[PDB]
Symmetry: C3
Amino acid sequence: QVTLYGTIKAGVEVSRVKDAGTYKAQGGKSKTATQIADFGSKIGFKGQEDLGNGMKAIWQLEQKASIAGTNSGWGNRQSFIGLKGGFGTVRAGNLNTVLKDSGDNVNAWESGSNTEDVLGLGTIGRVESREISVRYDSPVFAGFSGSVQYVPRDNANDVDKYKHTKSSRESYHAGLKYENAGFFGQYAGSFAKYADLNTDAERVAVNTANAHPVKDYQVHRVVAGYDANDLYVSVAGQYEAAKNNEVGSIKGKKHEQTQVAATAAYRFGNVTPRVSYAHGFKAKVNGVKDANYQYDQVIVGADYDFSKRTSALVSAGWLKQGKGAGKVEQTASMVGLRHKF
Amino acid sequence: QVTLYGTIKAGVEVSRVKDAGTYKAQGGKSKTATQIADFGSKIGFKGQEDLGNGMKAIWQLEQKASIAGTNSGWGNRQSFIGLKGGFGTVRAGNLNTVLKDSGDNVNAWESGSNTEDVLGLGTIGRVESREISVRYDSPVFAGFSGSVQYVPRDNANDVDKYKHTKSSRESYHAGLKYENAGFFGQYAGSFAKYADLNTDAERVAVNTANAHPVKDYQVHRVVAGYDANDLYVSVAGQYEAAKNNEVGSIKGKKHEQTQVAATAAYRFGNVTPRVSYAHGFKAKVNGVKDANYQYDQVIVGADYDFSKRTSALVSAGWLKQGKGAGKVEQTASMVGLRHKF
Amino acid sequence: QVTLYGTIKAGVEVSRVKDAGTYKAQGGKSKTATQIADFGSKIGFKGQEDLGNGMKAIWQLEQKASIAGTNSGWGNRQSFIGLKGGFGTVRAGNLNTVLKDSGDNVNAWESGSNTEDVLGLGTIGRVESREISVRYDSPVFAGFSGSVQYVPRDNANDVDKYKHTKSSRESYHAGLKYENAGFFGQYAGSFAKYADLNTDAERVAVNTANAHPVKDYQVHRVVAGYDANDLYVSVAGQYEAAKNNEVGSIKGKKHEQTQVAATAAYRFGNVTPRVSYAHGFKAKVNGVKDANYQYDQVIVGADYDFSKRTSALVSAGWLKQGKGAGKVEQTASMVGLRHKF
Ligand SMILES: OC[C@H]1O[C@@](CO)(O[C@H]2O[C@H](CO)[C@@H](O)[C@H](O)[C@H]2O)[C@@H](O)[C@@H]1O
Ligand SMILES: OC[C@H]1O[C@@](CO)(O[C@H]2O[C@H](CO)[C@@H](O)[C@H](O)[C@H]2O)[C@@H](O)[C@@H]1O
Ligand SMILES: OC[C@H]1O[C@@](CO)(O[C@H]2O[C@H](CO)[C@@H](O)[C@H](O)[C@H]2O)[C@@H](O)[C@@H]1O
């Protein structure tokens, strides 16, 4: 096989921000924006070859392809070469992290890049990435399957390759999943002895502007629920923790945050209504409570399946971030269209 | 369906510029340049899905692909998702403007980017663009069809999305076409309450360097002719008008220019000879006649069809711009090859 | 026909540099680097159309596509339009140079960009490029075939197109090949009356930072050997020469260098062991011996063919550059996987 595949998806999104700091017009409310936005259109090529006696060569080259013409690049979405057989699957390339894959049971929503935090559960997803790495995925044995994945030191920091003067940013990713009669539970996590975070607590490249070096960077996620008989329910808990590793007054002090998320949906023929809620508890930053990181959000919407490949989509979200006067409120809604090929 | 399609096209172009201002060697004549040039090679992917009872989902992802290796990007040519049925066609994405589509009956010529104004009718085409927009196209009823298209404020100016401090650059595009027994007539136009022009009178993005803000920016084009029985004839008139909207002495003053174009071609078996003429009358700039905008051009050439997909091409053009001493004359010729797949 | 094709290839590479100048830790040895690296994954589209009575239109659009997601661009590998028939083949576009094609019988090794000089015979290949050009390839007549290729002045230097104030960087490329019963011999070469080299003696664009202008830039390569009955042997000699053309004390003085390369491999069923050796003799730079350019290298490895399209790969290389204290030693090894589609 060699298959061309992808998804074209886009819609009209309407959004308003409430922020006393950045806007002054009527209680810190911004104007209402209305935008045509691509929702993350993508195109890939992939294939497999039977190598004889169980084993297959596998490969994939997947690309961002926004119908707004803003992307460029090959292989900037999940892309790999690997082998598959009775042993499971081994791949190397630009790979989804185990946590990024588990996000499929957390964030079912479609939106443009501008609305990812309010028309989707974007905040809980901040830990998810693609990385140049090697990954093993097991076969499914008695309901159970698992993954392990590694990003080498010299891929996490190319510059330092021959002069190991910077602490390693290598990382480990692992997951375990169980499925039985519609019921599912999964753990997914990561560890990096050293890492770097921006102020949104996303991992960024070493030496990025305003990056914060951290040590013992760990992320744990558990997701459980039910997906069968027209019903979908998902509940997720997530925990992120690190020590400050920046040279200065606060080195050694602990960062941490807990997030939770829940989704329910029910299929009525070709219509799926869906509701999501998510909450970020106050973070500990340099060992001190920081309510700037707390958030609450709800999203409601529905998908209308014209076919198995084509859906019309609608949603509305409300998000509140922080506390008091630095507080930010986002509201948004969209209508859209998705076509898989 | 999912179809791969495109056109590979390129040739050798020979060109000379006469410009007393920029060249001094022998009456302001430049040296003669000879270049291999891609003519606008492109590749796309597209598809459709019957949704039951008349309606279809449609999508397209088209890209610039120069065989000289100078392009990068997905979806930087006409790209969309939409629906089609008895109601007509609705699309959203990076869409040809109605005026850009009408250009098919104005500029039949192929050339590289360097020769677009002399080996093609590039000046009349300066009003044509692709825009992130929504568009409706009607069915053909008794010879008649039409289009309407809109570019939202927050797509024309993303930066200003939440602070509507800049006047809207939203625009409307519309067209009407009639066809009967080889005869065709079409109107295509656009209006933008506010817009921005460079000195070549092309629309550029707000806040571009040396952009000129304008108000009441309107473009009207009429094209009429005959296309049947081996004969092609086309005549076009175009009118562009705007008011100066730049803070300063000349705010409120009128810009305007009229252009006309005509083409004839006749098919003799596999050979098509073609001739084009175009003229830009003196522009009004800040309410004052500006002969720097006037131009006259002729192009002659032929296409040699090896097949329905493969043509060899030859052309020669002469263009004169401006008047007196700021005057510019361009001459050029090419030979080339075009293959559609 | 319209065919999608390509090769996905990548592996894990381990490398160490010995350089007293840039490293100080234990006799100028660097740390050992271990990296997942793409080996030059690529994807193309190509086609042909019978034009009647022997002739065919041909075209190709080939792209770099690294599964690490670092490439962007269309047509940045061999890409063209052309015609083919009894006369041979004519193409125009981003074309392999005749010398670049002859490199197929010189460098059989796969590696990432970081290891090209030690896990491949990269130094001898420094003369190889793709150029926007026109090329003719003859049919094979009684074992003999040949190529001629030209890069025009205004493609080698676009800026200067209309003001021929800079000496032409146009170039000629030519080759001749003979094949008989497994035995092969080929000459490939190039001439450019004027050119520009960086300090690694690679051709760079005019006006590049630290480019060195040269005159009478010639490259000659002869490759001979045997490729049949499970046995492969190749021997190559290469000669490069130019005159300094930089305004200053040393203008007119001669640069030159000779390189040689040899490879043997034998197929044992699905396993091919291979060995390569290459040597660069002391260069003459500005008429003076420069041992900084001398080098010696060996590579050993094997390919394991799972199928005709899928190979596992292993190699190890040792390279020594220069002499004395400016001396550089590189060691490396890899394991990898290659899949052609
Ligand atoms: O997979 C869950 C979620 O993915 C959606 C919305 O993001 O579609 C996107 O992700 C799919 C992964 O299965 C891709 O196949 C698709 O191309 C992409 O648009 C929905 O299908 C689904 O709710
Ligand atoms: O369509 C008119 C004109 O288009 C030409 C030359 O520009 O071909 C280009 O535009 C076509 C649009 O129909 C594309 O299909 C093609 O890929 C592109 O090269 C000629 O075909 C024709 O005279
Ligand atoms: O062709 C010789 C050499 O090419 C290899 C390794 O570079 O494969 C690369 O080059 C091929 C050219 O034939 C391409 O087809 C392929 O896509 C690319 O990886 C080996 O196949 C061979 O030893």
